[PDB]
Every structure is written in C-alpha cells, then in structure tokens.
Design a protein around this ligand. Structure first.
Ligand SMILES: [Zn+2]
Lengths: 285, 40, 278
C-alpha cells in the first residue's frame, strides 16, 4: 500500500507522453501480467476461504492468520502525541540543581513544552540543559553519575519571568532516561520540593521500539541472550496463534450450513457470535 | 485531492441532439414493448 | 373470573381498612391469563359489544398496517447483506447490517405481531359471545328440529377456533414435517418402498427438502433418502447420478464463483450417509 503515489505518477506520465504502438503494447502487457499473477495468488491462498467467508459476517481490519508476519502491514505510520511526563514516569530522583527521570520504555521525543507555576521573584532559572540516554537501568541512583552516561540534547536560555518555554528538538531523539539541569540562576534532595517555583513538563512523543546500544563485548553477549529469549517467546506465541485455525474452520463449516436455530444483540446466530469472538477477540490479540 | 488521476463539458447544439436522440430511443423502446403484447 | 368475593358464613373485619385482629388471611390461585369478555344478557349490552368490536377492529387495522410497513426495510437490508461487502471497524464487531436485520425483525416485527395476535384473540372472543347470544335469542323467539350429536357440534360455537389459515408458512412447514415422518415410517416396508420410489420421491426429496427446515429435519430427510435406496440398484444409481451431476456442474464454475464449491455440503453429507450404511 506504499505505492499509491508511484502508480499515480506512472499512470499520469503514460497518459501524457505520446508513444509508439510497441511501447503501448509492452506497457499494457506488463500491467495485465501483474494483475493476472496477483489474481492467481489470491484465489489459491491457503487462508483465502477463511477470509472470504469472514468478510461478509464480521468487521475486521487486518489478516491475523499469516504464517510470516509482514513488516509492511505490521508497521503503520504512528503519529506524534502530547504526553505528560508524569504519566510515563516510573522512578525519579532529585538533587540540589538537577532532576533525573526514567520512563516506562523508549520514546521518540520531538518537542518539550515546560510550564512554570507559583513562581517567586527570589530566584528563577536562566539556562536549562536537557540530557537523554537510551540505556535501561533498574535504579535511578545507579544512573545518577553525571559525566559518562549522558548526551547533550539542548541548552535553552530564558528571559526573566518566563512561564512557558518551547524546547524544540531539530532531530527527534530516542530516549529512555532523561535529565534536566539548571545551569544558571533550589530543590529538596530527599523529596524534590521546590519553594521558588513549580515545574511541569510536556512531551511531543510517540512510542518507539528500540534497544540499548552495543559498545563492547559483554553487551554483545547480553544482546545475543536477549534475542534468544525473544525468539523463544515469539515461537511460543506463534504456535499459540496457529492453534486457532482448526476451530475457525469448524465454525465456518457449521455456519455454512445455516440451519435455523430457535432461541436484539443476543438474537444473532450463536455460531456467528462465536466466529466473531474467536477471530476479532483472540486471534487479534 | 493531490492525486492526479482522479481529475481525469458539452455545448448546446449537441445537447439538443442528445435530447432528441433520447426521445427517439424512448419511442423505439415503447413500440418494442407494445410489439410483445399483441394478440396471438 | 374478573371479580371475586369471599364470605365468612359460619363463625371481624374493619369496614374502612379491613384489618382483622382475630387472624390474618393470605390467598393463592392456580390460574393463567385468559382472553374473555363480558357476557350479553339484553340489548344495550349487545350495542356495547358491537361498539367495542368496532373499536378493536380499528385498532387491529392500524397495528396491521404498521406491521406490514416493515417489509420494504427488511428487503433493503436483505439486499445489502447479500452483497457481503467487507467493512472496516466482540459482540459489536459483527457486521452492522446483520445487527440491523436482527433489530428490525426480532425487535419490532415481533412486538407488532404480538400486539396483533392479542387484539385478534380479543376480537374472536367478542364475536363468539355475540354469536352465541344471537343464537340463544333466535331460539327463544322460535320456541314461542332435532339435531344429531355431530350436527350440534357443527352448528354450535364448539367447532369454531381450530382451523389454520390457508396461506400460512409455519403450518405448511409443519405439514411437511409430518409428511417426512410418515414417509419414513412407510418406507420400512420393502413393497411400499418400491412403490414410493416408483412415484418419483427421490428427486422431489433431493430438489426440495434437502436444504429446507431445521437441522433435525434435514438429517431425517437424508436418512429417508438413504433408506429409499436400501437394496435397489436402480434407485441407488438415480441418487448417485443426481449427486454426481450437481457436483460436476458446481465444480465447473467453482473457479469463477466459490459459493458453488461451498454449497455442496448436503450432497456430500448424503453420499457419506449412504456409504456408511452397509
Ligand atoms: Zn399457522
């Protein structure tokens, strides 16, 4: 489905360019050959009967009975959304002039909008530094170490009295743990309470599928072990998914008979409801 | 709306001609249907 | 009964509220709802009955028109369902047209049918009462001809409410069920089996009753068709010819239409049943 614009342009250019009859014949032959091959693939597909019967009974988006999952169909274009930091926060630790946060997982952050409330004239922030990393740790204090394990993202200077600031990222960052540093002028070391002001964070982010980077050899070994575990889990889930097909075909065979049954959302045929529950409920998950 | 292929008029004299042709086609279909109801 | 009275004859109750200090009484009835009307004893009662019957007929006519107004929507929904076009979006994930069909038929047509049946029963009871009163009055006027036992039942209102409508789908289905049962009983005699197969019963059962009715009826029809060819080579050859012809005709156009290939389940079930009986 990615080739809508390509076929649009191909049709337009073939229509506008005057060409010889041999080129026209070759073009038409290519188009008809592709059509015939795709029709042949469709009519002999192992799941063709199940999909053809299911289309007229239930409303389903995708095809969840495929042996090899398709990267094209498994990867839709997910858009960015505005997420509040506390909703994805997992563990947090504060120091005198910094704040370290960990999230549930990785995220592709694009913009950060910071809001300030209950500010006091005594002291405000002049320069904010943003740091990020995509290494997963279990304890925040472990990652508290400043120099080695952080990456600079953006430094923003503020005019005095600013209430909202728009830290834009020219390139979206894939991050799991974040850090905010107040470079130029504060926070409780134990609980993080601030009397001078109250800070709130927003992110223009979306969920991302990424893993820790590899820098040395034991990281490679950990990556290999993790990939083996993931392959085993995927194999188990794949077998559990493919186990559903016999029940689906039995239900389809029973539905095809269309025998009247004696007993308004509950007055639908029980076999149709079972088919919907089996396909759109379990196979989808 | 940006697709070029989705965008892929008639004068008055040909409009009169088309309306007349519609009239004779209607009359021919009428007589054809009347022909099947004749007594046998 | 509609109104009841209880009297304490041999031995208490408050005239205003009915409280009894001596005892407390509770009542139970072994009853069921009944469709009946007031009796007629004189002329103004007859006039009231006639007016009530006219009102009931008007209400029944209105409800009947409201019921028959549902048919165009039902046929439009059936036409849309027959297309079976995929729709993109677990009790809510069934096709919306199927939900609309179920709501239209089992939700509204059922209520209209029930109201119509209630009003029709009331009208029938009123008519029966009026006709009985008219017969009694005519007999009283004439008394100022012997009938046999069967003639009395024929004339009286006893033989009035046990006849089915001529154009009834359910009654025709029931008669077909009885015919299948009787024919299954009859086919156990070899001579009757030969006569029945000579009548041409196998083709009629194959063409009509294989796919119609409840699942039990369909299996019974399959059993009867198998029994009709129990030891008759000609009948077996005829049934096999029908099955093979239908399967070949469907398989010829299976490629351009898969419903042809998926609507052979009853022929193949018949073949399986015939083979499984040695
Ligand atoms: Zn009936």
């Amino acid at each position: 489905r990615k080739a809508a614009q390509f076929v649009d342009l191909l049709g337009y250019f073939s229509l506008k360019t005057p060409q010889t009859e041999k080129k026209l014949k070759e073009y038409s032959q290519k188009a008809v050959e592709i059509l015939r091959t795709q029709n042949h693939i469709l009519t002999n597909h192992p799941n063709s009967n199940i999909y053809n019967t299911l289309s007229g009974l239930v409303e389903f988006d995708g095809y969840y009975l495929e042996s090899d999952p398709c990267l094209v169909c498994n990867n839709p274009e997910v858009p960015f959304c505005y997420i509040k930091l506390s909703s994805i926060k997992v563990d947090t630790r504060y120091t005198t002039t910094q704040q370290v946060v960990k999230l549930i997982g990785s995220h592709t952050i694009s913009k950060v909008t910071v809001k300030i409330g209950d500010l006091k004239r005594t002291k405000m922030v002049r320069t904010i530094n943003l740091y990020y990393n995509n290494r997963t740790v279990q304890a925040i204090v472990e990652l508290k170490n400043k120099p080695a394990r952080w990456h600079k993202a953006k430094k923003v200077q503020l005019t005095p009295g600013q209430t909202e600031v728009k830290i834009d990222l020219p390139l979206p960052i894939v991050a799991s743990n974040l850090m905010i540093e107040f470079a130029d002028f504060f926070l409780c070391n134990a609980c993080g309470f601030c009397k001078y002001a109250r800070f709130d964070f927003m992110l223009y982010a979306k969920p991302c599928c990424a893993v820790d980077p590899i820098e040395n050899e034991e990281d490679r070994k950990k990556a290999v072990s993790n990939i083996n575990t993931l392959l085993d889990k995927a194999d188990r889930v794949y077998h559990q998914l493919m186990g559903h097909r016999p029940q689906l075909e039995n239900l389809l065979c029973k539905v095809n008979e269309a025998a009247p049954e004696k007993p308004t959302s509950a007055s639908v045929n029980r076999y149709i409801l079972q088919l919907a529950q089996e396909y759109c409920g379990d196979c989808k998950n | 709306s940006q697709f070029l292929l989705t965008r892929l008029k008639m004068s008055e004299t040909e409009r009169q001609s088309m309306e007349s042709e519609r009239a004779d086609r209607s009359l021919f279909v009428q007589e054809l249907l009347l022909s099947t109801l004749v007594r046998e | 009964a509609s109104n009841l009275m209880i009297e304490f004859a041999d031995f208490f109750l408050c005239n205003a509220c009915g409280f009894c200090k001596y005892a407390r009484f509770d009542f139970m009835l072994y009853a069921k709802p009944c469709c009946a009307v007031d009796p007629i004893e004189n002329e103004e009662d007859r006039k009231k009955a006639v007016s009530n019957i006219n009102t009931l007929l008007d209400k029944a006519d209105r409800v009947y028109h409201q019921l028959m107004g549902h048919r165009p929507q039902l046929e439009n929904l059936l036409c849309k369902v027959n297309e079976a076009a995929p729709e993109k979006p677990t009790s809510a994930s069934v096709n919306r047209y199927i939900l609309q069909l179920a709501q239209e038929y089992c939700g509204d047509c059922k209520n209209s049918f029930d109201e119509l049946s209630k009003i029709i029963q009331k009208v029938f009871a009123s008519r029966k009462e009026l006709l009985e009163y008219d017969l009694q009055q005519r007999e009283a006027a004439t008394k100022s001809p012997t009938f046999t036992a069967s003639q009395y039942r024929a004339l009286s209102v006893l033989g009035c409410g046990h006849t089915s409508s001529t154009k009834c789908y359910g009654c025709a289905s029931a008669v077909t069920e009885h015919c299948i049962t009787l024919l299954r009983a009859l086919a156990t005699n070899p001579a009757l089996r030969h006569i029945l197969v000579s009548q041409g019963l196998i083709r009629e059962l194959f063409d009509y009753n294989l796919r119609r009715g409840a699942a039990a009826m369909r299996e019974e029809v399959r059993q009867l068709m198998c029994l009709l060819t129990r030891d008759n080579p000609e009948a077996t050859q005829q049934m096999n010819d029908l099955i093979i012809g239908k399967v070949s005709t469907a398989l010829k156009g299976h490629w351009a239409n898969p419903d042809l290939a998926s609507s052979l389940q009853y022929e193949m079930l018949l073949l399986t049943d015939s083979i499984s009986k040695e």
